[PDB]
From a paper:
Single particle cryo-electron microscopy (cryoEM) of the purified wildtype Tse15 revealed two major 3D particle classes; both monomeric in assembly but one that resembled the expected β-cocoon of the Rhs domain and a second that had the Rhs domain with a globular protrusion at one end (purple and yellow respectively). A map of Tse15 was produced with the clade domain present at a maximum resolution of 3.08 Å. Following refinement and manual adjustments, the final model of Tse15 spanning residues 14–1395 was produced that resolved the structure of an α-helical clade domain (residues 14-333) and a core β-strand rich cage (residues 335–1395) (in orange and grey respectively). We could resolve the cleavage point between the N-terminal clade and Rhs domains, with the sequence matching the previously identified cleavage site and a clear break in the connective density of the polypeptide chain. The toxin density could be observed lining the interior wall of the β−stranded cage and appeared to have elements of secondary structure but not an overall globular fold. Between the Rhs and the toxin, there is a clear break in connective density that corresponds to the cleavage site of the toxin as determined by N-terminal sequencing (L1395). We were able to de novo build four separate peptides (chains B, C, D and E) into regions of convincing density, placing a total of 106 of the 195 residue CTD toxin (blue). These chains were modelled as poly-alanine with some glycine residues placed to allow an improved fit to the density. We also noted that the short helical chain C (10 residues) was localised to the exterior cleft of the Rhs domain, suggesting that this is indeed the point of toxin entrance or exit (blue). Also localised close to the entrance and chain C was the longer chain E (43 residues) that appeared to interact with the end of the clade domain, close to the cleavage site.
Residue numbers in the entry: 14 to 189, 204 to 287, 298 to 333, 335 to 1255, 1267 to 1395
Write the structure that this text describes.
């Protein structure tokens, strides 16, 4: 720990002078203890002239005091002298012209000391940002120049500081205010301290530094004055560490290293810094409940253990019996609900020596003057008023329409909320008080609310302690309580019977308390005093063990985690946490204006989000971390009408009489009108096209119906209590929800009944954790939870457990899959993940930069490295090869909305353009294929009123129209202003029919559960001239809603089987009977071969059914050897296939930034690819003999293909040079290369093309795919016709004519083993098995390769 520590803050954030009071009191105590003289006695002979910097004056005086009394040596002496000099320099007057410069430099020195004195401390870039802000806020100079001139002028400052210190010490060695104005001078230095001490700060002023029970005194002052010259003259020695010269030198070095109208208004706001070495105890906790203001809950500001426990809920009125504990609530020691326990409506106003003490419902004291009974008053920083009445009843206006009346029953000593009111809702809670021995005891709560009426009768024992909370006339108590002989609430049984047990020591302090499941949360307090702070708390098993240590001098707490990793929080006098210094040194900050509203938040990683409010106290400028200014505007009624996002796109609004938004004119002008019911709820919303959606609510306010824009109403039903008992679909299908009435999970969702009669059953514990889920088929998925409550095991229907392990902080430590392969996670002493064993021994090491963002991922082969922007959006990635050294870099650019705007890599650059609303309107894709003249493919998007996509002009000028019906339902897909399919939809807006342009008529019929039940395709009109396509697929599902049979007309009956989890383990049919063997993790196994392992432990299969695989050190397949085939895959640093050598026929692949293959070169043949997002819209082929382009048209918002139209030429794309190129040539695309051949797809239930038909309706192409995508036989009428051939496969895939690998977007899917040839780019975010494709290909897709 540094010998001397400080609290650097802003002048605006502090209104009281409590810290100044503490410093003055400490000085007075030192004077009394040493010189035996009060400040008044020494005031006379204290005529010394100094600048009117009260902060610097107090700091210097306090500094001088410690130096004279408390002697220090070593580095501690150097630091103390440095801080004394820093406080002095901003204190002496002459020269007057430099007073502002010196008083600005003093907080600079304070900040550099606070940030450099720490062991392994440095000037982070945020430090330089803060220094620049503080400097510029006052003189508006340059940080480098100011620091340099200070360094050159340091000697004069130190000389004048020595003179000032000599003068100050020449006031005591010999035996006998509130304005920080540079131009004002203190005639006497003692006078401001005396004036401070007189101020009624209302903050405890007990000195926190004890003198040494010694003597010396004047001897001490003589020694101090003698050594002042020695300690200050040597301060300038930059060679000496931890000195003003060293601070300036280090700050300059950091600045040099890191260099490679409304602003002025906020400068007047007071972002100027200010630091003190002594601070007063926080008055109380802040209203904030964030992780920075209270632990997982000891509030840091006061160290009070408060636990808010809800006993029962009255759903029809929205009342939860929140019992609030506060180990510092000595006023509620005799509280009827339990000692130091607060129930709802127990807040009251007590009488003390100071005056009236109000204890809000949250448990936060608010001392009020004795004049509240005679006049109105308002507590600062909250915004609620107290007003009296002639009848002695005090009304609290907490903010809103609620007025709470308080009455006194004993000489105006205790004011108990007799009842409340609500001129608005016309409601009002009535509290009936039983009086005994002049002690008012709450007896009945009358909830005379229009929602419902209740009589919360209470029952007391001999001690007058609530033992049961009844309702109206119910025999069952909503809440039962038990108290030990000391009056402590040692057990609180809620309405469901789930007891909570509380353990107290002999002083009403809660040491341990168990949740409803029996899991304790132990606590220990520094002492048995009522106000003693909680200093330690750990779950019963030791997890989450946290040690709080409050700094003796400052308003700081060192919150040690389970591994003694401190996190030093600093809080204001009101408890607001204005700083958070992590163990690694990253400091988060929070500025606050006089009203304690945040105006600047420098996060740990440097992100800064400011909040400039208007004269009406409304945030009218939220500058983002990226520099985007969002200027809100408000109308005369104080309503947010006009919002202006960073790009200038203005969201207008208009409000009705009830301050509800009745209009919403987005930037493009698509007005969205709402309507509300008298209860201030959305009853009806009108879109921009006129579509009207009607919403209905019941007496409770729970939505009970939603009439879609097309007159389709789905009704939600609720019992009297308000628990959802059914939700009916637009076609009258009821999903009835059933809740438990007894057991551990009483009152929770016990089961769900589905429209086909199948019942899901659940099981929870008392705290809501799922313990056992039974699926519709009866398969049980038991979950096991460890002592701390975190999931520790999940036993699925096969009895295969994914055992998790968590370290003492609740972070995942080791994850064990079904194969007993351990996925070790490693965390550095600072608590960041810095390792990952990936089930295969592949250790990924994570590095972090000074901003704490991920900096490198050192995989065994590739060393990823990230470069970020000021906002933290990645600016580039650098995948260096640790062995070969080849480096691949991607570069990103973002607009002011934080949306990707230009992504580039070696072989592409994608420029994304967006309209005011933020939707993609243009997408220029600058291909950079090697050996090929660079060319640009230009996508366009035209949108309708409701933001749907209605027209996309593909690069070669071909336009795909989506003619939309209503609120986004497609009734036809055009193609060059020529229809290619027209849909017909049912009540639920499900497609029940589509008329293809080739005269075919595909009707889909869905069963009760909405699963596809049949699919017939046939011509609208039949002709004997030719054999038009005609086939059908009737799908039958088993109890688990897994496709268990298909009555296909072409393939016959396809019967499937599944294992309990849901993995497909067989698929029999006439064509081929198949069987699959998955290990517990999910890897296909070669069961037929005995020597093959029974489980692929590392998830990387080395052999499966005649294919032997060879993986590199990153888990990607680098070779696949079988009978007569030797495929070698070359993976780039992004783990992407950039070359394939199949029996010597080398291929070459290339990808844009997003992993979308842009080409595939095979000797002279080149297959360009084009994407409009995640979908391969077109592909173009270049070769000596065959040139063609295919345009794949997919169904709306899906990867299922619809038709492919092409022309016998290479695609016509915008040759790279911009604004002139696309628009002119895109109109040259309006001339267009006419699509020669159309061909329509016909997929199965999951979107896999099963056949194809030309424009005349005939079948032209059939594929018999194996279950896992492997092509078994293709029946094409014209093999050579490239437009009658299909390379599409499982939804989102593409067959490769050279490798037989299906190219998913991000990975290559190798159908033989039904697993990707490389590990998932997103690691475990995709699943436990990172190489497996899917469990069930009949209903799961994985279209993007993740």
């Amino acid at each position: 720990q540094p010998a001397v520590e400080l609290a650097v803050f802003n002048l605006n954030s502090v209104t009281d002078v409590a810290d100044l009071q503490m410093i003055a009191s400490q000085v007075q105590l030192y004077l009394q203890v040493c010189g035996n003289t009060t400040l008044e006695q020494i005031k006379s002979k204290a005529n010394i002239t100094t600048v009117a910097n009260i902060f610097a004056l107090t700091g210097s005086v306090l500094d001088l005091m410690l130096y004279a009394t408390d002697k220090k040596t070593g580095d501690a002496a150097v630091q103390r002298g440095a801080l004394l000099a820093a406080n002095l320099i901003g204190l002496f007057s002459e020269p007057n012209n430099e007073a502002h410069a010196r008083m600005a430099l003093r907080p600079m020195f304070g900040l550099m000391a606070e940030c450099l004195y720490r062991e392994n401390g440095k000037i982070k870039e945020t430090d330089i940002k803060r220094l620049g802000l503080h400097l510029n806020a006052m003189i508006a100079g340059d940080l480098e120049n100011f620091l340099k001139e200070t360094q050159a002028k340091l000697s004069s400052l130190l000389i004048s500081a020595t003179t000032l210190g000599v003068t100050i010490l020449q006031s005591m060695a010999t035996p006998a205010a509130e304005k920080r104005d540079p131009k004002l001078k203190f005639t006497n230095w003692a006078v401001p301290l005396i004036d401070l001490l007189g101020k009624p700060s209302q903050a405890n002023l007990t000195p926190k530094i004890q003198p040494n029970i010694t003597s010396r005194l004047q001897q001490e002052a003589t020694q101090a004055i003698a050594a002042l010259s020695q300690t200050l003259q040597q301060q300038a020695n930059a060679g000496q560490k931890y000195t003003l010269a060293w601070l300036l030198q280090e700050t300059l070095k950091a600045i040099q290293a890191l260099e490679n109208t409304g602003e002025y208004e906020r400068h007047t706001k007071g972002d100027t810094l200010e630091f003190v070495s002594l601070q007063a105890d926080a008055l109380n906790a802040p209203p904030c409940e964030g992780a920075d203001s209270q632990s997982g809950s000891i509030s840091y500001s006061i160290g009070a253990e408060r636990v808010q426990h809800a006993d029962f809920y009255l759903p029809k009125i929205g009342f939860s019996f929140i019992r609030q504990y506060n180990s510092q609530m000595d006023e509620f020691d005799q509280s009827m609900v339990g000692a130091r326990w607060m129930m709802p409506f127990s807040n009251m106003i007590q009488q003390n020596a100071q005056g009236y003490l109000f204890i809000d419902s949250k448990g936060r004291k608010h001392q009020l003057p004795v004049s509240i009974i005679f006049e109105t008053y308002e507590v600062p920083y909250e915004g609620w008023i107290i007003k009296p009445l002639k009848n002695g009843e005090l009304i609290l206006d907490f903010g809103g329409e609620w007025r709470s009346h308080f009455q006194s029953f004993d000489g105006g000593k205790n004011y108990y909320l007799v009842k409340k009111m609500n001129e608005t809702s016309q409601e009002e809670i009535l509290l009936e008080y039983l009086l005994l021995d002049h002690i008012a005891y709450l007896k009945v709560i009358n909830f005379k609310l229009k929602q419902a009426e209740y009589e919360l009768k209470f029952a007391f024992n001999e001690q007058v302690k609530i033992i049961a909370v009844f309702l109206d006339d119910k025999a069952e108590p909503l809440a039962r309580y038990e108290y030990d002989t000391q009056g402590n609430l040692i057990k609180a049984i809620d309405q469901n019977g789930h007891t909570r047990t509380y353990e107290y020591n002999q002083f009403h302090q809660l040491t341990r308390y168990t949740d409803r499941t029996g899991r304790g949360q132990n606590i220990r307090y520094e002492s048995t005093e009522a106000k003693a702070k909680a200093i330690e708390e750990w779950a019963d098993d030791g997890s989450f063990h946290t040690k709080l240590k409050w700094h003796p001098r400052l308003r700081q707490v060192a919150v040690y985690d389970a591994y003694d990793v401190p996190t030093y929080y600093y809080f204001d006098l009101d408890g607001f946490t204005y700083r958070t210094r992590l163990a690694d040194g990253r400091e988060s900050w929070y500025s606050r204006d006089g009203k304690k509203r945040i105006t600047r938040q420098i996060d740990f990683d440097g992100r800064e989000t400011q909040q400039e409010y208007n004269d009406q106290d409304q945030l009218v400028k939220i500058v983002q971390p990226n520099g985007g200014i969002i200027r809100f505007a408000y109308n005369k009624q104080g309503n947010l009408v006009e919002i202006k996002d960073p790009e200038g796109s203005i969201w207008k609004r208009e409000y009705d009489e009830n301050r509800n938004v009745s209009k919403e004119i987005n930037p493009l002008g698509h007005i969205t009108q709402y309507k509300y019911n008298n209860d201030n709820q959305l009853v009806e919303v009108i879109d921009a096209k006129g579509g009207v959606k009607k919403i209905q609510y019941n007496e409770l306010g729970q939505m009970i119906s939603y009439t879609d824009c097309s007159g389709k109403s789905s009704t939600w039903e609720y019992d009297e209590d308000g628990a959802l008992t059914a939700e009916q679909t637009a076609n009258n299908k009821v999903v009835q929800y059933f809740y438990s009435t007894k057991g551990r999970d009483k009152g929770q969702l016990q089961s769900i009944i589905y429209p086909d009669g199948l019942k899901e059953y659940f099981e929870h514990d008392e705290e809501g954790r799922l313990l056992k889920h039974t699926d519709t088929k009866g398969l049980v998925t038991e979950y096991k939870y460890n002592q701390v409550g975190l999931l520790e095991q999940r036993i699925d229907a096969n009895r295969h457990s994914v055992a998790y392990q968590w370290d003492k902080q609740g972070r995942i430590q080791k994850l064990i899959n079904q194969n007993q392969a351990e996925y070790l996670f490693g965390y550095n002493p600072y608590g960041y993940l810095i390792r990952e064993q990936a089930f295969d021994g592949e250790e990924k090491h994570y590095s972090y930069n000074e901003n704490g963002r991920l900096f490198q991922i050192r995989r065994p082969n590739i060393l990823t490295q990230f470069d970020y922007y000021a906002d933290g959006q990645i600016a580039s990635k650098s995948f260096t090869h640790l062995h070969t050294g080849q480096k691949q870099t991607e570069q990103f650019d973002y607009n002011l909305n934080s949306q990707l705007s230009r992504a580039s890599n070696e072989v592409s650059q994608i420029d994304l353009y967006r309209n005011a609303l933020g939707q993609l309107v243009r997408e220029h894709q600058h291909y950079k294929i090697p050996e090929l003249k660079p060319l640009t493919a230009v996508l366009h998007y035209e949108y309708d009123e409701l933001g749907n996509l209605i027209k996309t002009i593909r690069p070669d000028g071909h336009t795909l129209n989506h003619l939309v019906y209503g609120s986004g339902h497609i009734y036809a897909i055009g193609l060059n202003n020529q229809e290619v399919v027209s849909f017909q939809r049912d009540d639920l807006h499900r497609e029940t029919t589509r008329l293809l342009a080739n005269g075919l008529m595909q009707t889909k019929q869905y069963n009760d559960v909405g699963l596809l039940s049949s699919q017939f395709i046939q011509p609208e009109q039949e002709t004997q001239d030719y054999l038009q396509y005609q086939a059908h697929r009737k799908y039958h599902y088993d109890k688990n809603y897994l496709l268990s049979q298909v009555e296909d007309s072409r393939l016959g009956k396809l019967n499937y089987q599944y294992d309990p989890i849901g993995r497909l383990i067989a698929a029999q049919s006439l064509h081929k009977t198949e069987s699959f063997n998955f290990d517990p993790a999910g890897n296909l196994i070669d069961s037929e071969s005995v020597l093959s392992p029974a489980q692929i432990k590392n998830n990387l299969i080395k052999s499966y059914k005649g294919k032997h695989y060879q993986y590199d050190v990153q888990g990607n397949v680098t070779e696949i050897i079988q009978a007569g085939k030797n495929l070698k895959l070359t993976w780039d640093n992004q783990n992407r296939l950039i070359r394939s050598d199949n029996n010597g026929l080398v291929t070459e692949y290339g990808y844009d930034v997003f992993g979308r293959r842009l080409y595939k070169k095979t000797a002279k043949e080149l297959t360009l690819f084009g994407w409009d997002g995640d979908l391969m819209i077109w592909e173009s082929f270049k070769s000596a003999q065959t040139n063609y382009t295919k345009h794949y048209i997919y169904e709306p918002d899906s990867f299922v293909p619809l038709l492919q139209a092409g022309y016998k030429d290479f695609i016509q794309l915008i040759e790279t040079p911009i604004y002139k190129d696309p628009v002119w040539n895109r109109n040259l695309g309006k001339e267009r290369t006419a699509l020669e051949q159309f061909t329509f797809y016909h997929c199965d239930q999951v979107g896999t093309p099963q056949t194809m038909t030309n424009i005349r309706g005939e079948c032209v192409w059939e594929i018999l795919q194996d279950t896992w995508g492997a092509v078994s036989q293709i029946k094409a009428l014209n093999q050579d016709n490239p437009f009658e051939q299909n390379n599409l496969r499982f939804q989102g895939q593409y067959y490769d004519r050279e490798t037989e690998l299906h190219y998913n977007r991000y990975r290559y899917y190798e159908p033989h083993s039904a697993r990707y040839v490389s590990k998932d780019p997103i690691g475990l975010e995709g699943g436990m098995n990172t190489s497996s494709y899917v469990s069930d290909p009949n209903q799961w897709i994985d279209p993007k390769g993740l």
